[model samples]
Target: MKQYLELMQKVLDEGTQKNDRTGTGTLSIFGHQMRFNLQDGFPLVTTKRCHLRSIIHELLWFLQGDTNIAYLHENNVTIWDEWADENGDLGPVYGKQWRAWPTPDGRHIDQITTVLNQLKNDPDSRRIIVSAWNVGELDKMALAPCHAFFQFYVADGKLSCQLYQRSCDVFLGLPFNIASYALLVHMMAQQCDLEVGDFVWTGGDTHLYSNHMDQTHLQLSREPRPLPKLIIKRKPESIFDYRFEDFEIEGYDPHPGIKAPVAI
Candidate 1:
């Protein structure tokens, strides 16, 4: 957790002031990376309380290959409301790409299932990657994917995952991004019958919005508490079968939540 706070400070100190699509200026940096050992604990942010409910539902939604906000809204998650159209459709977003990427022949490729199979049968394969940045479908999306691509790696009987995020809203979004991927790593490892390994996060064009400076400093002022442990109540038949009720966090003592306006 210290690493996360340090990364924030680093951005404030060295990031260049740049204009952005949201019209809110940003302190931007080109690239950065962080590694979290799942063996240590779940990498939920301890400086500020994060809603695990939203995080779990979001992941489950993505697993369902859904590109609409209806499911999220039904579950009381409104994070995607801003980007969704009146119809609640977000075009072909993360879930669509991850679960059912369209091909020229009108077939769909299930990237999640593909990766799971690779992890089980070909653990050493270096090509187990899932990408959401579909170039041809970018214009159809409500917002382009920021956390665009990710890869899975297995070594020493432990499963690790690395994510490549093209854009990051550091103050508001990075915490959720880290937790979501970490959760994914745990679920993948469990399904593969392997031990959890590291969650390596890589960012491109990482930025903190100018308006979030106060909130960012507020978060930095707080000391990080112990990382939480994720307890999955039951082993679902498959990754797609997981429900929000099955996941729980224990020992998550953290500072109160800080408010920040979203860039959108």
Candidate 2:
């Protein structure tokens, strides 16, 4: 959690001023990396209380190969509401890219399933990767994938994952991104019958919106609490079969929630 606070401070102190598409403006930095060892604890930001429920549902939705917000709305997660159209479509987003990447031959590739098999059959292989930046399909998406690419590695029976995010909203989105990928790493490890390892997050064009400066400073003022532990009540048949109820966070004592407006 200290690493998170340091990152926020680093962006504030050293980031360059830049205008964003939303016209909110930002203090932006480029090319930063962070690592969280899963054996220590779940890498949840403890400076401000975070809702893991949304993260869990969002990940599950992505695993379901659903590009519509209908599933999210049904689960009461409004994070994707802004990006969805009237029909609740965010065409060819993460889920589509991960589970059903379209090919020129009209065939689809399941990146998740591929990675799962690779993890099981070839743990030491260097080619275990999943990419969501479908270049040809980016135009169809409401928003471009920020966490565009990720790679997995295995060593000594432990599984590690690294994500490369092309864009990040430091104050609002970065923490959630960390937890989301970490959760994914845990699930992937469990499915492959391997121990959880490190989650390495690398960011490009990471920024804090000007409007969130106050909240960012407020968060920095607070001391980070102990990192929380993730508890999986039961192992599902596969990574795609996980339910929200099967996951829980333990010992997550944190400061009160801080509210900030998200840039559209």
Candidate 3:
């Protein structure tokens, strides 16, 4: 948790002003990295009372190979509402790129499954990776992925993931990004039959919006609570088989959530 806090401090102190797509000016910095050990505890942000519900639904939606927000709506998750089109479609986003990346030869590549097999079959290899930055389909996407790529490595029977984020919003989205990947790491470890290791987050163009400066200070003033523990109720038959009911969080006592406007 200190890793996250320290990153915030660094950006707040040293980040320079930068313009953003939404015209919401930001204090932006480049190239920051942090690691969270799953063996230590769940990496859910503790400085604020963050909810894992939407994040859970989001991950489940991504894993279901769903490009539409219909499933998310059914689960009462509205995080994707702002970006979805009239038909609730976010064309060829993370889900599509992850589970069914279209090849020029009219073929589809299932990256999640490929990475899973690689994690199991060739643990020592560095080829295990999943990427959401489909440059060819960028125009079709409602929003380009910020956390674009991730790689996996197994060492001493533990699976470690290195997520490379092209850009991230520090106050609002970075927390979600952190937990989202950590949760994925947990799921991957379970399916690959390996102990969960570290999730190393590598970021480029990381920024804290100018408007969120107060909220950032509030979060900084708060002391980080003990990290929470994640409990998987049962081992699913496959990575795609996991349901929302299969997970739980325990021992998480965080400060009240700080509200801030999303740049959108």
Q: Give all TM-scores, in the order shown.
A: 0.98, 0.98, 0.98
So what's the TM-score on candidate 2? 0.98
Off by over 4 Å in 1: none
User: Model 3: which ten-residue window has the lowest total lDDT?
Assistant: 255-264
Per-residue accuracy of model 1 over 131-230 as CA lDDT, tens digit each: 9988988999888999999999999999999999999989889999999999999999999999999999999999999999999989989999999999
Residue pairs with colliding backbones in model 1 are none
lDDT of each: 0.93, 0.93, 0.92
Error of 3 at 245 (Å): 0.8
- Candidate 1, residue 144: Cα displacement in angstroms equals 0.9
Tens-digit per-residue lDDT, 116-176, candidate 3: 9898889999789999998899999999988899999999999999999999888999888
Among residues 3 or more apart in sequence or in different chains, the pairs in candidate 3 whose N, CA or C atoms overlap within 3 Å are: none
After superposing candidate 2 on the true structure, give the runs of residues whose Cα lies further than 4 Å from its correct spot.
Answer: none
Q: What is the C-alpha RMSD of each candidate to the true structure, in Å?
A: 1.0, 1.0, 0.9
Where does candidate 1 have its weakest 10-residue lDDT segment?
Answer: 255-264
TM-score, candidate number 3: 0.98
Clashes of 3: 0
Lowest summed lDDT window (length 10), candidate 2: 255-264
